[PDB]
Symmetry: C2
């Protein structure tokens, strides 16, 4: 896996910010796109843009072929059984909302439990809050270990026979944790519950096998995996998606429409109201082709390389706290002793280094960590050890600078 | 308004389909994009793609500036009062669903009436069906005149003091009708109802003034107005949007998140859960700049030119039925005597001409017209009289061909 060759594919990387070479370390907020994706979008709008699913004229046929072929690439990419289980959405937030609306709100009675965790992104928290509110059910949290991982025994004790939904992240956008999704699916099924995986931060960086994970729902976002903004995927087990009613209504999702009553389409289109995100989904398919040609396991190896490197070099700086486990994905969330993370991020951007500062859409986790805010540096398949060197050097310079005041 | 100059801006137009020069006459299903829009997307992904609203590093600031500047361009484009009234969505279908979910389902009791029309696109029908189902309210239809327009007196007789929502199209994607949205807003307000305009087919072709129309909600789609797929707009009167609860939940739309309770953001972000359609909205802003530089009233004049031309030349063919009024937008929905519309569309595509055939997501209207399917040809700012000449010549050739069998 030659990473110079990969970086030459991303035009955004080759610029300067405030006089310094750009060091983009914020892929966990959003990733950059290779020429293959951008040029897929260009070819779409230049050559075969048309509305889909009325194979009547040639460009319509070409566009439909592109869109549904993107659906098939997504099916292969996460090892789903059928394209009917692959639904295009606006992003992970919308997919989780669709499960919360069309599954939770229809299958929850008082006394039923929805269990999540303290490390969950807001997208995997608030929909469940609102659903238990609407149904009178109960929201429960799985406690975290002091290194920010989840114990299987805490899972077994928190999920009871009254649990109908367990909702959990695959990889934490803050701690870097990789959660035991497979074992947790077994534990949820033993108690008669479904399991909903927020896969927003796992899909870009590691292979997904929904058959091996046996997850009932899986949600992912294109913009974090080299794909266009505005598009993501909901995977649901076909059997579950058959009995869920649509979250949105309109054209393209109906069969017969009367004055007062309508019947829906078969899956997947039952859950795709309106003109779909045609260009965005085709570009996501291009992103998938790109990743598969690099190789997802090679990308995982690269990220483990960079994460081990980052942890070791961060431990070479005194006065820096890193949050989370040692086994992790390619991100380091941290703080500097007596320096606010926003300030760290500002000085790093003055050095041309892009990190995030704030709560990372995980306020309960921030409270659990006993901090109000954090800095985070996130790595992807275009990032190098030289860039982490620059990060830790700038962190040292920042701490020297704030000591001399 | 030089239309050769405009056509040279759309690369998709300059190709051949089945040996013939492409004649794209299906803009009412979806429009084509000028270089300015496609290159706006390219510049975004090549130079300043980053997640928005955490103005922490330079690319994040550039992307936030682009996204919110797109919001401001949309505000100017439809003469809304405040950016807080401009909400980015997936498209018109989603915007209408958001009104049906967050307004209708919270303000409808049994005995309340939701009135629509027989000419409405499915996107402006089924959400209301489901909302009156969920609330026990009543769905009513405004009857149509025999030329497919709406009488103001039929409006006054159908909307009663028990009506809370009137939902109506601005321009009909099938009949070409321009509905009296302004007078209808007055009539709905006199009865204490709100008015929801499906503006999907008016926004691309004519100026929108929500202050002059006094609509309470207005929905539009970017892909029909030279913009990227996957993005549209909901406009609501700020006062109404303040009291509506969000349709989706997650990050970017919250203020404080507790274990069980959260508070929302101010408008507009209260209604934008998750990472937004960044590139799509910026490209929509580019589309708006492009149209404004051509001039919307000039585009309206061009479409009236082409529509009058098309009607006159269609009346020069015997055995063709055109549906709808004489005063219309730039589209002609029709049928050939004893030729099925799908067949017409197929032979026209063999001539390289792109039309649609089917029900055009308006099944109640099809039943009202007493037909099962239809052919439709739709014009936009890149279409010429020569292309309509080709259309009517190919229609004549089609009818001769199906007579000689």
């Amino acid at each position: 896996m030659n990473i110079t060759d990969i970086r030459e594919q991303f035009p955004i990387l080759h610029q300067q910010v405030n006089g310094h070479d750009l060091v983009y370390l914020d892929s966990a907020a959003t990733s950059q796109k290779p020429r293959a994706v951008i040029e897929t979008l260009d070819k779409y709008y230049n050559q075969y843009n048309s509305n889909v699913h009325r194979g009547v004229h040639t460009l319509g046929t070409r566009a439909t072929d592109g869109y549904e072929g993107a659906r098939e690439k997504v099916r292969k990419f996460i090892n789903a059984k059928s394209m009917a289980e692959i639904i295009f959405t606006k992003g992970t937030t919308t997919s989780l909302n669709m499960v919360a609306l069309s599954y939770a709100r229809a299958n929850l009675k008082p006394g039923d439990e929805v269990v999540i965790t303290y490390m969950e992104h807001h997208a995997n928290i608030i929909p469940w809050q609102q659903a238990v509110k609407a149904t009178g059910a109960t929201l429960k949290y799985i406690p975290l270990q002091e290194d920010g991982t989840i114990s299987l025994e805490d899972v077994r004790e928190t999920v009871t026979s009254n649990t109908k939904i367990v909702a959990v992240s695959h990889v934490s956008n803050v701690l870097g944790t990789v959660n035991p999704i497979k074992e947790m699916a077994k534990i949820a099924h033993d108690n008669g519950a479904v399991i909903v995986v927020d896969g927003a931060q796992s899909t870009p960086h590691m292979k997904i096998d929904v058959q091996d994970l046996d997850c009932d729902f899986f949600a992912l976002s294109s913009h974090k995996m080299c794909g266009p903004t505005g598009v993501g995927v909901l995977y649901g087990k076909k059997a579950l998606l058959e009995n869920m009613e649509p979250a949105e209504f309109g054209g393209e999702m109906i069969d017969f429409v009367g004055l007062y009553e309508s019947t829906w389409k078969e899956l997947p289109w039952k859950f795709e109201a309106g003109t779909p995100i045609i260009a965005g989904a085709i570009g996501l398919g291009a992103a998938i082709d790109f990743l598969e040609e690099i190789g997802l396991d090679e990308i995982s190896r690269h990220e483990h390389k960079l994460a081990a490197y980052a942890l070791e070099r961060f431990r070479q700086l005194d006065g820096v706290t890193v949050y989370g486990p040692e086994e992790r994905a390619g991100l380091v969330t941290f703080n500097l002793d007596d320096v606010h993370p926003h300030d760290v991020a500002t000085v790093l951007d003055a050095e041309g280094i892009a990190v995030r500062a704030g709560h990372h859409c995980a306020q309960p986790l921030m409270k659990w960590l006993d901090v109000t805010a954090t800095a985070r540096a996130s790595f992807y398949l275009y990032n190098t050890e030289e860039e982490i060197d620059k990060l830790v050097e700038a962190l040292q310079k920042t701490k020297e600078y704030f000591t001399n005041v």
